[PDB]
From Swiss-Prot:
Family: Belongs to the AB hydrolase superfamily. Hydroxynitrile lyase family.
Enzyme class per UniProt: lyase
Quaternary organization: Homodimer or homotetramer.
Name of the molecule in the record: (S)-hydroxynitrile lyase
Keyword Lyase: yes
Site label Increases basicity of active site His, positions: D206
Keywords: Lyase
UniProt-annotated catalytic positions: S79, H234
Post-translational modification, as annotated: The N-terminus is blocked.
Binding-site list for (S)-mandelonitrile: T10, S79
Binding site for acetone: T10, S79
GO MF annotation terms: aliphatic (S)-hydroxynitrile lyase activity; aromatic (S)-hydroxynitrile lyase activity; methyl indole-3-acetate esterase activity; methyl jasmonate esterase activity; methyl salicylate esterase activity
This enzyme's EC code(s): 4.1.2.47
């Protein structure tokens, strides 16, 4: 079977992170959309214009609004992209065949939306040469960050080639987790986000989303299906591109 995959990058990143996986999925016959979220990739906004994870998610919500009735997609979110998935699913649950989490945060419906982010910061508190700044939007102080190049090299792109690490140095931009905004956001709903099928994909060799964190998430909110990829790094769409495409084909043949 063929599906329409919507690929959702993480904070400080853009559609470009999917530059290897998108053509591979298309060679299997799928339709693929790889979005730039707000103030990401070549989107023309700057992060200081964005006031929350929901506003950050606008291009995904606008895309889903534009799907004609009856068309469903499979969302694929990497790292922090899981939060964008939950926000989208509380607005467009009927257009989502399933959601795939790719070394990603897995929000739930019983705890506040910041819950798994707070836990991530406990498990991985030292972001190395990452820098931080503060800005104000809609009366709230938001912490912005710029991922540090050592952190990129050692922890996110550990086993990626130098030409891929180079793309990350060139193209990563200031962003935000909006942690304090999430912490005051209404909970993700059970009828919306809660109802979608969730597939959890991960590697135990991830040097930032460490096994203690990913196994904690799986126990906290049971996925419908779990796939463990052997080897690679946090950026499995670069280091295990073919394996990720194989998994996504199976998801396409399972959920519609």
């Amino acid at each position: 079977a063929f599906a329409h995959f919507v690929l959702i990058h993480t904070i400080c990143h853009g559609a470009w992170i999917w530059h290897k996986l998108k053509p591979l999925l298309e060679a299997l016959g799928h339709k693929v959309t790889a979005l730039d979220l707000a103030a990401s990739g070549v989107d023309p906004r700057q992060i200081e214009e964005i006031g929350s994870f929901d506003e950050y998610s606008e291009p995904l919500l606008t895309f889903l609004e534009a799907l004609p009735p009856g068309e469903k997609v499979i969302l694929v979110g990497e790292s922090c992209g899981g939060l964008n998935i939950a926000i989208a699913a509380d607005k467009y649950c009927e257009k989502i065949a399933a959601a795939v989490f790719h070394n990603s945060v897995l929000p739930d419906t019983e705890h506040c939306p910041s819950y798994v982010v707070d836990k991530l910061m406990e498990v991985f508190p030292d972001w190395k040469d990452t820098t931080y700044f503060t800005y104000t939007k809609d009366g709230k102080e938001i912490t912005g960050l710029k991922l540090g190049f050592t952190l990129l090299r050692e922890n996110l792109y550990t086993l990626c080639g130098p030409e891929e690490y180079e793309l990350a140095k060139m193209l990563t931009r200031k962003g935000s987790l909006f942690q304090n905004i999430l912490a005051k956001r209404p909970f993700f709903t059970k009828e919306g986000y809660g109802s979608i099928k969730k597939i959890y994909v991960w590697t135990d060799q991830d040097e930032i989303f460490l096994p203690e964190f990913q196994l904690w998430q799986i126990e906290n909110y049971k996925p419908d299906k779990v796939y463990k990829v052997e080897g690679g790094d946090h950026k499995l769409q670069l280091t295990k591109t073919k394996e990720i495409a194989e998994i996504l084909q199976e998801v396409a043949d399972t959920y519609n």
